[PDB]
From Swiss-Prot, chain A:
Function: The BBSome complex is thought to function as a coat complex required for sorting of specific membrane proteins to the primary cilia. The BBSome complex is required for ciliogenesis but is dispensable for centriolar satellite function. This ciliogenic function is mediated in part by the Rab8 GDP/GTP exchange factor, which localizes to the basal body and contacts the BBSome. Rab8(GTP) enters the primary cilium and promotes extension of the ciliary membrane.
TPR repeat residue intervals: 40-73, 74-107, 108-140
Name assigned to this protein: BBSome complex member BBS4
GO molecular function ontology, one term from the record: alpha-tubulin binding
Tissue expression: Ubiquitously expressed. The highest level of expression is found in the kidney.
Example GO BP: protein localization to centrosome
Keyword Ribosomal protein: no
Gene expressing this chain: BBS4
Domain of life: Eukaryota
Subcellular location, record wording: Cytoplasm, Cytoskeleton, Microtubule organizing center, Centrosome; Cell projection, Cilium membrane; Cytoplasm; Cytoplasm, Cytoskeleton, Microtubule organizing center, Centrosome, Centriolar satellite
Species classification: Eukaryota, Metazoa, Chordata, Craniata, Vertebrata
Span covered, complete protein: 28 to 167 of 519
Subunit structure: Part of BBSome complex, that contains BBS1, BBS2, BBS4, BBS5, BBS7, BBS8/TTC8, BBS9 and BBIP10. Interacts with PCM1 and DCTN1. Interacts with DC28B. Interacts with ALDOB and C2CD3. Interacts with PKD1. Interacts with CEP290. Interacts with DLEC1.
Disease: Bardet-Biedl syndrome 4: A syndrome characterized by usually severe pigmentary retinopathy, early-onset obesity, polydactyly, hypogenitalism, renal malformation and intellectual disability. Secondary features include diabetes mellitus, hypertension and congenital heart disease. Bardet-Biedl syndrome inheritance is autosomal recessive, but three mutated alleles (two at one locus, and a third at a second locus) may be required for clinical manifestation of some forms of the disease.
UniProtKB/Swiss-Prot annotation, chain C:
UniProt feature coiled coil, ranges: none
Disorder noted: Ciliary dysfunction leads to a broad spectrum of disorders, collectively termed ciliopathies. Overlapping clinical features include retinal degeneration, renal cystic disease, skeletal abnormalities, fibrosis of various organ, and a complex range of anatomical and functional defects of the central and peripheral nervous system. The ciliopathy range of diseases includes Meckel-Gruber syndrome, Bardet-Biedl syndrome, Joubert syndrome, nephronophtisis, Senior-Loken syndrome, and Jeune asphyxiating thoracic dystrophy among others.
Pfam families: BBS1, GAE_BBS1
Main localization, broad class: membrane
Gene for this chain: BBS1
GO MF annotation list: patched binding; phosphoprotein binding; RNA polymerase II-specific DNA-binding transcription factor binding; smoothened binding
Subcellular location, record wording: Cell projection, Cilium membrane; Cytoplasm; Cytoplasm, Cytoskeleton, Microtubule organizing center, Centrosome, Centriolar satellite
Gene Ontology CC: one annotated term: motile cilium
Name of the protein in question: BBSome complex member BBS1
Organism, as annotated: Homo sapiens (Human)
Matches recorded under InterPro entries: BBS1, BBS1_N, GAE_BBS1, Quinoprotein_ADH-like_sf
Assembly and interaction partners: Part of BBSome complex, that contains BBS1, BBS2, BBS4, BBS5, BBS7, BBS8/TTC8, BBS9 and BBIP10. Interacts with the C-terminus of RAB3IP. Interacts with CCDC28B and ALDOB. Interacts with PKD1.
């Protein structure tokens, strides 16, 4: 048929789970060029490859595009704030985690990354209960 | 040793740009910039402390300390 | 506890996965015929391949990139082999003795009715370019329910195309397909193999279909909050039914018999690369190479670490011995075999293996087929005499004598030196202090000799350092001098200082000689370049100063740059 089949994400997730990052970059360039543009999962795992290499400044603007195409998803607004925990800008990240903490409740790691990002600040007392909030939902 | 972090992190910043060999500022950058939390510059710091001197001990206990943070939690 | 090398054919081109290989008898005889959904050596066209003996039997083109392969029974009509199923796109193609028929269709779930109002307003020539582009922004941004496989390209089209498609874009009857990801087999109505088999299909709409033999309508429907890529079934029916599935979010989801919700959820740290069950425990493979194990309800039982990256996992089942083991195709080329916590054996020979099955091939009952990463083949054959042992030695920590207490040897030239220290040492202590007491004075009298002149490139009040260098292009009569300023504050931008260099007049010019420095931001380093124009060959040092704005002429950070002798 005419438009796109638009879903071949089952293959790209097989490449990234196999750590074959050189063949996966071809299919990301293939599927994004096969569609007219703005594919979702081809953007996401391309940002998760650059975050494995150290290019965290490039794995933050790609997660900004992935924060646009689905603003009701609690994944990317959580996954952006992981890429801001690593660039050093700590206090900027604790509100984006709160931005995902209100779009979804009862989540384990969002109440845990808020714990560890307070300890790299100097606020300690409101970090100790955050991990207690992160332990009761899921022990790790 | 005294506490002047931002003073120290600029002298190592200019010790590296004068000697683009000699691993000792590069590794020493990545134990100031790791204790703060900037795990992106503290990778490229401890990247050059491998290429300019491999078989170091406390670089290989630092890149694998960082590459666990980069994959997932 | 050894194998037999059947063949080794490293020249073939078989690019596939462990999900799309199957062992069944395509002609109804006793010969088990391997079937492989070959993708393509460079991502080429998908071509179906079946195997008879060590070489291929029939090839066939495929409509799309295939997902998995299974073999399924009809009823008691004939005792022939189960009919082959092939999942590819949103259309599974069943194959029963190489007969292409029954292109099954997905249910094609319809979009949400807020999109249907945009579907129903422009098709009667009531189309406006602006207010269509804003009504879609009220759909996607408040609460999505998007179905944006086709609805997104039903909305992203701009002013020029949509006004040219006032009839066409509204004649595009949307199909709303959804691509199947995976496929597995469940014995229907009972746990025995003599009963019929029942399809389970997971797809991109995070839902788990379950199909029926010979009618293929729908049996039921399950709801999962994440897209599944690895799944299995314990296999029972009509009294109890456990459906386990792994997802892209790194979780383990299990399903009850009729409750269509994930009753128990357990997580990992990373993506599971394979989901295989044992008789009662269920194992996963993390991509951090930590092969776990979880029980029926699912708790932590044991964990084996693997010294290389996991790449393939599969199930071992011997009909004679009754042994249930789990495979692990590693990255260097070895294939480790494991029971509950014991390594059974390894096969070190080939390169990296991507595909793996273990069953009967043709007449022989013990065959463990594997496949190179380049596309070639390698076949192993077990013998009847070999039963699998541990047979593992006691590999200790350090049995090597590589370093036996590396300590340097102290010769006679040290042992006479301690006798000089023992008797006349009391004169040596007072000799050190009164020589060090001049050293503190000689340092501080030379320290303050430059601190008052502020020769040091470091400061405290206005907090920048100053580095400077002669650049490579600065050679000969022409000469270029860079200069490096950078603030050391976090939030205090120093403002509008002055750089001037007094210098003993040699025969160079330096035409600007007095700048106004820009606003230094905290963090960035600034290159500042000049142009020395020397006329003949001399060498004499410059002194480059930086001042505060108007009041303090005390000149902090004056750097006595020593020049190179140019020609």
């Amino acid at each position: 048929e005419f438009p796109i089949l638009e879903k071949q994400n089952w293959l790209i997730h097989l490449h990234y789970i196999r750590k074959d990052y050189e063949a996966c970059k071809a299919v990301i360039k293939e599927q994004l060029q096969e569609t007219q543009g703005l594919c979702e999962y081809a953007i996401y795992v391309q940002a998760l490859i650059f975050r494995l290499e150290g290019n965290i400044q490039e794995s933050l603007e790609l997660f900004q595009t992935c924060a646009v195409l689905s603003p009701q998803s609690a994944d990317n607004l959580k996954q952006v704030a992981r890429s801001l925990f690593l660039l050093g800008k700590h206090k900027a990240a604790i509100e984006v985690y709160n931005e995902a903490a209100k779009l979804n409740q009862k989540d384990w790691e969002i109440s845990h990354n808020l714990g560890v990002c307070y300890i790299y600040l100097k606020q300690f007392n409101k970090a100790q209960d955050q991990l207690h909030n992160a332990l009761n939902l899921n022990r790790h | 040793r005294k506490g002047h972090v931002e003073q120290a992190r600029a002298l190592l910043q200019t010790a590296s740009s004068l000697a683009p060999h000699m691993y000792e500022p590069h590794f020493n950058f990545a134990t100031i910039s790791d204790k703060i939390g900037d795990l992106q510059r503290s990778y490229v710091a401890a990247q050059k402390s491998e290429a300019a001197f491999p078989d170091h001990v406390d670089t290989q206990h630092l890149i694998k300390q960082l590459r666990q943070h980069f994959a997932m939690l | 506890s050894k194998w037999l090398d059947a063949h080794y054919d490293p020249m073939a081109n078989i690019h596939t996965f462990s999900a799309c290989l199957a062992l069944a008898d395509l002609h109804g005889d006793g010969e088990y015929k391997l079937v492989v959904g070959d993708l393509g050596p460079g991502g080429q066209q998908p071509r179906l391949k079946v195997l008879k003996g060590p070489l291929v039997m029939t090839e066939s083109p495929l409509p799309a990139l295939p997902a998995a392969a299974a073999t399924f029974l009809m009823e008691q009509h004939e005792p022939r082999t189960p009919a082959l199923a092939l999942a590819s796109g949103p259309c599974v193609y069943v194959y029963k003795n190489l007969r292409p028929y029954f292109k099954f269709s997905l249910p094609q779930l319809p979009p949400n009715p807020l999109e249907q109002d945009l579907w129903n307003q422009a098709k009667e020539d009531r189309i406006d370019p602006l207010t269509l582009k804003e009504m879609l922004e009220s759909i996607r941004e408040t609460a999505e329910e998007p179905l944006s496989i086709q609805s997104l390209r039903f909305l992203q089209l701009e002013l020029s195309e949509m006004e040219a498609f006032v009839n066409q874009h509204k004649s595009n009857s949307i199909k709303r397909q959804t691509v199947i990801t995976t496929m597995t087999t469940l014995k229907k109505n009972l746990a025995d193999e003599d009963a019929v088999s029942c399809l389970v299909l997971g797809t991109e709409n995070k839902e788990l279909l379950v199909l029926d033999p010979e009618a293929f309508t729908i049996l039921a429907k399950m709801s999962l909050p994440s897209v599944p890529v690895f799944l299995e079934v314990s296999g029972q029916f009509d009294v109890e039914f456990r459906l386990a599935a792994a997802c892209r979010n790194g979780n383990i989801y299990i399903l009850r018999r009729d409750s269509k919700h994930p009753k128990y959820c357990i997580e990992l740290s990373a993506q599971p690369v394979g989901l295989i069950r044992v008789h009662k425990v269920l194992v996963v493979g993390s991509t951090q190479d930590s092969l776990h194990g979880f029980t029926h309800k699912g708790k932590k039982l044991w964990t084996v670490q693997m010294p290389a990256a996991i790449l393939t996992m599969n199930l071992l089942e011997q009909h004679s011995r009754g042994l249930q083991a789990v495979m692990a195709g590693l990255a260097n080329g070895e294939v480790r075999i494991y029971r509950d916590k014991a390594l059974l054996n390894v096969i070190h020979t080939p390169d990296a293996v991507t595909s793996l099955c273990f069953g009967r091939y043709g007449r022989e009952d013990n065959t463990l087929i594997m496949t190179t990463r380049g596309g070639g083949l390698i076949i192993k054959i077990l013998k009847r005499t070999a039963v699998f042992v541990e047979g593992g030695s006691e590999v200790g920590p350090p049995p090597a004598q590589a370093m036996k207490l590396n300590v340097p040897r102290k010769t006679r030239l040290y042992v006479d030196q301690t006798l000089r220290e023992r008797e006349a040492g009391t004169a040596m202590h007072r000799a050190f202090q009164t020589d060090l007491y001049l050293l503190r004075l000689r340092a501080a009298r030379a320290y303050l000799q430059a601190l008052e002149s502020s020769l040091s490139p470091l400061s405290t009040t206005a907090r920048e350092p100053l580095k400077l260098h002669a650049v490579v292009q600065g050679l000969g009569p022409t000469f270029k001098l860079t200069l490096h300023l950078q603030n050391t504050s976090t939030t205090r931008p120093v403002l509008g200082l002055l750089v001037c260099f007094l210098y003993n007049e040699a025969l160079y010019s330096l035409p600007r000689a007095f700048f106004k420095v820009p606003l230094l931001v905290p963090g960035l380093n600034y290159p500042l370049e000049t142009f020395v124009e020397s006329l003949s060959n001399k060498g004499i040092s410059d002194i480059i100063k930086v001042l505060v704005l108007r009041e303090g002429q005390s000149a902090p950070l004056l750097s006595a740059h020593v020049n190179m002798p140019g020609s």
